[PDB]
C-alpha cells in the first residue's frame, strides 16, 4: 500500500534546477527486467507514466535469478534540500527498562509505502531506454519515496512517527523504538494481553498503509540488533572471537582493536593501548607487524577476560546509578556502571591524552567527565561516583590549580593503585637552599643551544646542546639545575612556557625531557620555581644570559 | 500584529547546531512548557524538511523556564538587529545610582514572526537514550533569546514607555534582548517605587514582570603590596607585575627597583628599599588607580573577557578589545563552576550596562565540564559567546 | 601421531626459573572432563604422568556438549625464550603464479603432532586437582607442542618446513604455501597426475606424523583465504556489503573504512579521506556522527565502484609490470598494476602527508616509492611507471630541489589532472620590482605580535597580531608583503624557517597562513625570496626590526 | 684454528633487525652463495630457537657478492672490538702519497667463531611474495662485516705481514673491517709493484685478493667570490656566508661590509666596494684557506658527515663531531641516489684513512628511496650509520 499520511513538502536547493541526466543505452536483458519491474510497480501505484513535456531525467540500471532496479540519484541528491538528521544517537541497551514482553515488527516495503510530495515527483523522472535507443523510451516518475534518494530515510521515519503518535498517546506504558524498517515494541502486559496489543498496533499500522508480519513470522528474543544481543533480562555484545594468528597484518590488528573496543562496553578491564601502538607509522594494509612483548601481554589478558561470557543488566529507574573507576596503568582507566553491587549495567574505558603533559588527578577528572556525559545520554541523570582518590588529595589539587572543575557526588574507595600527586612545588622560596638562575639560548639558524645556570653560591655551568629549539634549552636548563642541586632548591627562569608546564605538577608527558624533569622533581624534598621577565637586567638572570648567549 | 520581513543576507544559511544532552527533569520540563506553547499557537511542530536547529535548555525558584541558545542565529542575522533595526545604547545608563533589570520577554510572544523566517528558529527536545526520535518545533511569534525580537518590538516598546519617560525624564530605560535596564539617581525607596510603577505600565500590555549600582563601579587596580621588608623574590614579583603593567599603562617604571637586584642573590635574602625605589613605586601606584591612557571602546570591535581563578572563591577579570589594553578590570567573590557562571553573569551584565553588548569569554575550564554544568546555575535570559582556554599562571599572579 | 622429526631445543630466559603457579580448586564437572580428556591424550602419547619431584606447575581449566582443556601458560610464556618470527609477511594473490590445479590440505591436530624438546617438557607441568583439593592431584607434562604456549606456532612451522624440504627439492615445479595448519599445493600437472602427486605428498606427510584429509574432504576452489577469494584464473576480495544506515556511529564508520581500505586492493578509485575526517576528535564508540556532504559524496562514489564486481589476475613472470598513478583530488592518489592493458593484477591508493607542507610533484614521487617497495615485496622487481607528469616538469623540479631522489623507468601519460608546479621562485633578484624587507616579532609572555615591512620605495607598514608565536609573525610578514605588492616582488626575511617552507614550492599545507601565502605566490608573476642574518645591523632588516619591535 | 671467547656485556641482547625486501636476482644470487657456504661449513642452517636477525644484501663486475649488515651487532659488541681487542690507527697513513685498498675478508673464513657467539650472527634469505618461510643461517667462522672479525684475526694478520713490513718499513698497512689500507711514498709504478708483492704474501695464506692520494687532500674552502661589481643582494649573501663562517672560524669579520648596506635598498642596486671592505674581505679569504683553529678529533666521540646536493652533479660535505666545528670539508663531482652513494663511499673511505673510523651520515633523501636503491650501486664491504635529514637550504648555499 501507500500510506494516506500527508506528504512532506520538498524543495530543490535555492539556486538549482532539477536533474537532466542522459540515459545510457542498456542491454535488452536489462531493458526487459526494468519493464517487468516497472509494470508491477505501476500496477501498485508506486510509479506513473509521464508525458515528454517533463524535461527532467535520472539514469536507471538493473543488476542481478533476481532482477533489481537501481536508480542513480546522485545528481538529484546534489540538487535536493538538506533534511533534518534522522537521529542524534542510537539507544544503548544499558539504558533500556526491562519489559515483560518485546516483539519486533518489520515494515514491508517501507519507502515504497510512503507518498512523495506531489510537487516534487517530477524531479524523480527516469527513462527505460528502447532497444539501441532507436525510439522514445518509456518514462516514469515516482509517487513514493525512491530507493537511494536523499529524503527517503528522513521522510519515512517522520511519517512513521506521525503515524505512531496517537497509538503512543493512548498506550503510554508501551515502549516503541523505531529503527529503519523496524519497530521494537515492549510492554509489561501478560503474554496474552501483549499479543492483543501487538495485533491492534498492526491494525493501526495497516490503517496507515504499513504492512507487518504475522505472529508466526515475528522474531523471538534474543534479538540481534546493532552488534548487541538482547535477552529477556540481560544484554551483551554479539560473540567475539579473537582469531589465533601466527602473523598479524595491519588489517587484522585494526579489526582486533575494533572488536576489543566494542567488547569493552560490557567486558571490564579490556586494554587496547599496546595493540594501538603497533598501528603507528605508515604501514601497508597487508603488512605483517611483529607483536611486541607488551602487545603480547595485553592480548593474553584480553583473552582471559573474553574466555567466560559476560552480560549486562537492563535499567531500573527506581534506583541510583553508581560509577566506579579504576586506574589500570599509565594513561589507561576502566569503569563499571551498576545499580546493585556488581550487576553491571555497562562497562567502559578511557585512555585519551588531553595536552602534552598531565597528571593522574587531571586524568581521573576527565574520565569522570566523560562518564558523566555518557550517563546523561543513556539514563538522563548523573551517577554517584566511587573514586580511587582521597578527598584530601582531590581537595588539595583543585583548590590550588588555576582551572575550574567540579565533579558530582563521589566517595573514596580503596581500590589501588590510588591516584595521588607525586610531588608538590613550594608556595614560598626556601631558606637555606641554593637559588639556581637558569636560562636557555638557541641559534635559530644553526639549531645550536646553550643551557646553563648560575647560583647564589657562585656555582656556574653551561652545557652545549645540538638541534634544540629555544623552548627545549629553557627546559634543559631547569633539568640541569635539578640534577646538580641538593634535596632542596629554588629555581628562577624567564620562560613562561617552562613554568606553565611544571606548575601543573605533571607526572606524565609526551616529552622525554619533561619526564626526566618529573623524575627529578619526585626525588627532591622541596622545589620552589619562580619567573622573571627576560632582558630586564635582573640580577642572576642577567649573569646567566651572558654565559648562555655565546654563538 | 503583522510581520516584519527578515533576511540573513545572500550567502549564509541558517543554524545547524547540535542539541547538547539534557537530564530527565529538564526534558520533562521542556515538553510541558512546549505542549502549552503549542496549544497557545506560539510554536508549531515541524517536519524533516526543516534542516535547521538551535539548542534549547531549561533553567530556573520552583518555576522551570525555557532558554533557547540563539548565539548562531544572532551572528547570522546581525545585519538585521544591528544595522537595519539597531537599538541605540545610552551612555548615561552607567552613570546612574541604581539600575534595575526587568524581564520583558513575554511581550515578544504577542507579535507574529515573518513566515519566511520561522524555519530558522527550529529546535529539538531530545529524549533519554534516544528512545523516541525527538520533538521538533519552530516559532510562530518573536522568540525570546533572538536579538531580532527586541529589534522588531522596539516600536511597540517606545509606545509602551512614552508615558513613563515623559513623566520621568531623568530615568533612563534601555532594552537589551529580553531585559529592560532601568536606571535612576533617586534614593533607593523612590527608585523601587518607580520600578513598580513601570511594571504596572507594562502589565497593561500583557507583560506580568519578573539592583545594580554602576556609579559605584571602580576598576580593581593592579595591587602593589606595601611590606615590612622586601625579599629578592618579593621584588622580582614586583618587577614582574610592573613590567607587564607597563605594556598597558603609559609611564610605568621599574629601573630603580631593578638595580636593587644586583647579581646572583638568594631569593630569600632581605633587601633595603632605596628611596629612589620607594619613589618610583609610589608613582606607579598612582598610575594604576586611574584608567588606562590610550584605550577606547571601539563600537565595531567585539569585547573580550578573561577570567582567572584566584582560589578561595576569588575571581579576577578583564574586559578588552585589543589584548591587554583593558577597558575594565574587576573581581568577583558553592563550587568552581557555580562561581564561574556567577562571574560570567555579573561581567556580562556590567558589559551590557556599560557598552550595550556582551563580551566573548575566555573560560579557564574544560569544555565538557562547563557544558555539562553551566545550566545548573545559569539564571540569565541570554548566553554570551565563550571559548575555553588554559590560564597562563603569570597573568593570574599579576591580578592578585 | 607424533612426528619422528628431531625436536627444537628450547630454553627459559637466562635469569629465570620455570613456573610454579598454584592450581585453583576446580568443579567436579571440570575435574571429570579434564581426567577424561587427559586419559585420551595419555593413550596417544601427548602427555605423561609425572612424579611429585617435578616442582613446576601451570594452571588448567575446562570450558564448554563439548569439553575443552584450556591451559593458562601466561607465566611459562613470560619465562620462555624469544623465538624467530614465523613470517615477514603473507603472500598477496596478485603475486601468485597461476597453477592448473590447487589443493588445500589441513594438517589434523597440528601442534599435538609435533614433539616438544625432552629437556623442556618438565616446565609444561600441570595438575588436575582432586575434589575440593583434599588429596594430591594427578600430574602431567606435555610431550608435544601445547596449545597456547609461545613456541608452538614457531616450532610447528619450522618442523613442517624441514619435513617439506625433501619433497620440495624433488618436485621443484610444485608450489606449496604453508599457513598455520594449512598447506596450499599447486601444480601445472594434468588433473590425474596432480591427484597422484597430492597423494604422495599426503604419504610423505604421513611418514612424518602428519595426517591430512582424503580427496573426498579436500576443499574445492574458490578458496576463501585471509579475506580473499582465490578462483582458477582470477582473485578478488571477499564480498563487501556497505550497509545502508540512517545513523552512522563511530563504530560503523570505522568498520566502513576498514572494508573500503580492504576493497581498495582491487576496486580502483575508492576514497576514504572524507569518511576519515569524521573520525577525528574524541567521540564515543556508539556516538552518531552526521555525515558531511563531502562524506556523503565520497560514500556514493564508493557505492558506484562496488556495484559491479571486480577481479584481479594472477602473475605471469614472462611479462613486465606496469604501474599507473592518477591524481584524484588533493592528497589523494590512485594506482593500478597490470601486465596486459587493464587486466589488473592489483589496485591501491596513497593519501599520506609527509610533513606539514608539500607539493604534487613531491607527493607523486612518494607514491612512486610506496608502489616500488610494494612491487619488490610481491613480484621481486620494480614496475615500469606511467605517470601524469611531464618529463620537463619532473626534470625542472628535481634538478633544482635540494633533496635527492630518483624514480625508475617511467613515461608520461596524459590522464588529467596533470601534476604541475603552480609557481616558481626566481633565481635572481628582480630589477624594477619593489624590495620588501620583512620581519616578525612576538612577545613570549603576552603572545602579542607585530608583523610588518619596509620597502626600498619607502613604503612602511606594521600590523598587530594576537596569540601568535615568532614563527607565525615571520610568516604573517611575508604574507603582508605579498598582499600589498605588485605582480613582481623581492622579499627579504631573517627567518630560515619561513624561507625553508617557501623555497620548497609547497602548493598544499596543514597551515592556514601557508595556504594564503600559496594563493598569493600563484597569482604573482615573479617572486624572489632572500635571507639575511638577524640583528647584524643589515640595511632594511634593521629599519623593519625597529617598527616591528614595539612591546 | 681455535676460538676466542666473545661477550656482549651483561645487559644488551643481540640484534633483532628486519630484513629489507630484496629483488629476485639478488635473492637467487644469495641462495647460490649461501648453499655453497653451507657445503663449505662456513654457515649452518638454524631453527626458530634463534630469535636474532641481521639483514643481508647482495652487491657487485658479473660476480655477485654477499653483504651482511652488522651495524647493530657492531654497536652491541663494541667493547670487544674496540677496547678488548682494538686495532690502533696510524696517523702516518693520511700523510702518504698513495694508498691502495685491498679486500682481505676471505681470510676470516679460515678462523672458527666462538660457538657461544654464533647465534648472534643469524640472518635470513627472504622469498618473493613471502611464498616460502625464508632460509635461516648463522655463521661458523668469522663473518665479513663484523668488526670482531679483524679484531680476532689481527694476531694472524701480523704474522702474515711481518716479512713485508720488515722488508718495507716505510710502507704503512692498516686493517679496517674487511680491508687493508696500504700506503707509501714510492713513485706510482713502484707503489703498484709493492701492492702486487703484498698480494703474493697474502695468497700463501689462502687470500686471493680483490688508489687514494691522501697527501693531495686539501679542504674545500668556503668560497668568497670576486666580482666585477657587487649588488646589495650579493653583499647580503656575502655577509650571510661570513656570518655563519664566524661561528666556525676565529677572526672572521663583517663589520665593514655591513656598513655598505645602509638602509632600505633595492636588492638589484650596485654598490661601490669600499677599501676598508676589500681589506676585511681579503683577510677573511686567508682565514678560510687554513684549517679551523680550536677543533680537534676526539677519539671518544662519533664522527658526523653532512652532505648537500648542489645540483649539476655537485655534492659538498662536512665531517665534524660538534655541529659546525668542521674537521674536514670537501666536494664530490647517473642519478641522484647513485651519486649520493658514491659521495658516501668516498667520504667514508677518507674518514677511515684519516681517523680510523666511519662517520654517521646525515643524508638529504627520503628513507625509503635510499633503502630501495643504495645497494644497486654500493661497492664497499662496510656500511656506515645513516639517518635521513632535510637539508636547510642556507647551509647548502654557504658551501657553494
Ligand atoms: O524481554 C525483554 C527483552 C529486552 C528488553 C529490553 C527492551 C525493552 C524495550 C524495547 Cl522496545 C526493547 O527493544 C529494543 C531493541 C533495540 C533497541 C532498543 C530497544 C528492548 F530490547 N526488555 N524485555
Ligand atoms: O587454480 C588456481 C587457483 C588459484 C591459483 C593461484 C595459486 C597458485 C598456487 C597456490 Cl599454492 C595457491 O594457493 C595459495 C593460497 C593462499 C595463499 C597463497 C597461495 C594459489 F592460490 N592458481 N591456480
UniProtKB/Swiss-Prot annotation, chains A, C:
Changing residue 186 to C: Confers resistance to efavirenz and nevirapine. The record marks 397, 410 as: Essential for RT p66/p51 heterodimerization. Mg(2+) 1 binds at residues 106, 181-182. Changing residue 211 to F: Confers resistance to zidovudine. Changing residue 382 to I: Confers resistance to abacavir, lamivudine and zidovudine. Changing residue 97 to E: Confers resistance to atevirdine, efavirenz, nevirapine and zidovudine. Changing residue 131 to M: Confers resistance to delavirdine, efavirenz and nevirapine. Changing residue 545 to N: Complete loss of RNase H activity. Changing residue 131 to T: Confers resistance to delavirdine, efavirenz and nevirapine. It comes from the Viruses. Changing residue 175 to D: Confers resistance to efavirenz, tivirapine and trovirdine. Residues 430-551 form the RNase H type-1 domain. Error-prone enzyme that lacks a proof-reading function. High mutations rate is a direct consequence of this characteristic. RT also displays frequent template switching leading to high recombination rate. Recombination mostly occurs between homologous regions of the two copackaged RNA genomes. If these two RNA molecules derive from different viral strains, reverse transcription will give rise to highly recombinated proviral DNAs. This is Reverse transcriptase/ribonuclease H. It comes from Human immunodeficiency virus type 1 group M subtype B (isolate HXB2) (HIV-1).
From Swiss-Prot, chains B, D:
Changing residue 40 to D: Confers resistance to zidovudine. Changing residue 208 to F: Confers resistance to zidovudine. Changing residue 183 to C: Confers resistance to efavirenz and nevirapine. Changing residue 181 to H: Confers resistance to atevirdine, efavirenz, loviride and zidovudine. Changing residue 183 to E: Confers resistance to efavirenz, nevirapine and quinoxaline. A motif (Tryptophan repeat motif) lies at residues 370-386. It comes from the Viruses. Changing residue 82 to K: Confers resistance to pyrophosphate analog PFA. Mg(2+) 1 binds at residues 103, 178-179. Changing residue 68 to T: Confers resistance to d4C, didanosine, stavudine and zalcitabine. Changing residue 61 to G: Confers multi-NRTI resistance. Changing residue 93 to I: Confers resistance to nevirapine and efavirenz. Changing residue 99 to A: Confers resistance to nevirapine. Changing residue 144 to M: Confers multi-NRTI resistance. Changing residue 81 to S: Confers resistance to pyrophosphate analog PFA. Changing residue 183 to S: Confers resistance to efavirenz and nevirapine. Changing residue 67 to I: Confers resistance to HBY 097. Changing residue 181 to C: Confers resistance to nevirapine. Changing residue 111 to I: Confers resistance to zidovudine. This is p51 RT. The lineage of its organism: Viruses, Riboviria, Pararnavirae, Artverviricota, Revtraviricetes. The chain holds residues 592 to 1015 of 1435 of the full protein.
